[PDB]
Structure formats: structure tokens, C-alpha cells
């Protein structure tokens, strides 16, 4: 299924700190952030997505249209400019962020009743699993 709508509550988090370090996020921010449970809220209507990543320490939102390139500032994550594109590879939602960092982006897919995602930067991969609330 390509339907990723919902409020998703984190069940599992692996190598979140490696991903943050590959983005050069500072020590203090990483050490606090790696401890935290995350929520992902996805509003999906056709190609149009609104995605919100939250914890007690951040609230990061992005809107996009599948298949439409968009210039993006990554704001309080790592304050960089990238050229972003989100597309479907089968039922995997794939984001590529072109810019200073190699292999930067993410992948999301539904597997069972859960949302799985990969966050990638450089040679680091963070793997997460969320349950639908
Ligand atoms: C589809 C998933 C997305 C866009 C994200 C998953 C995690 C994100 C994130 C983590 C940490 C921060 N800060 C500010 C530490 C921001 C966003 S976005």
C-alpha cells in the first residue's frame, strides 16, 4: 500500500545518533535528541503530503508534492539548502535531498500495520519503526 496517512508513534530507533552526526549536528543536541521517543504525523491526499516529525525537543514540518522538485532549507535540523524530490519506487516513498551531503534523504514504507523508515546521510543509515496510533 502507498497509503501512509496517520499519526505514527515510534516503536524502535536504530543509529539515530549516527545519522545526526553525519549531518554535523552538535554534541549537546545529539546527546539529548538520541534519548527521545518520536512521533510522525502524515497527511496524505493524492500527491500532496504534509509531514511532521516531533519529540519533546523538536517539531519539524515539511510539505511536498510527489514528483515535484522543491528547494528546501532544512531549518533547525542542520540549516542547509538542498534540492529535494520525493517519488515512489513501488510502494516505497523515497526522498533525495541534493546538496553538500552525499546519500542524503529518507525512505518510508508500510510493512504490516507499521510504518518503517530509513534516514540516510553519508555512509550512515538510521532505521525506525512506528505503530499507527
Ligand atoms: C519523513 C521523515 C522525516 C522528514 C524526518 C524524520 C526525522 C526528522 C528530524 C529529526 C530531528 C530533527 N531535529 C530538529 C533534531 C528534525 C527532524 S525529519
Residue numbers in the entry: 1 to 133
Q: What did the published study say regarding this structure?
A:
We demonstrate the binding of a thio-dapoxyl analog via formation of a protonated imine between an active site lysine residue and the chromophore’s aldehyde. Previously, we showed the utility of human cellular retinol-binding protein II (hCRBPII) mutants as a fluorophoric tag, wherein an active site lysine residue (Q108K) reacts with synthetic aldehydic chromophores, giving rise to the formation of either an imine (Schiff base, SB) or an iminium (protonated SB, PSB).
Introduction of acidic residues near the iminium should localize the positive charge on the iminium, resulting in a blue-shift of the absorption/emission of the protein/TD-1V complex. Our prior experience with these proteins also informed our decision to maintain the K40L mutant for stability concerns, and thus we pivoted our strategy by incorporating acidic residues into the previously red-shifted template M14.
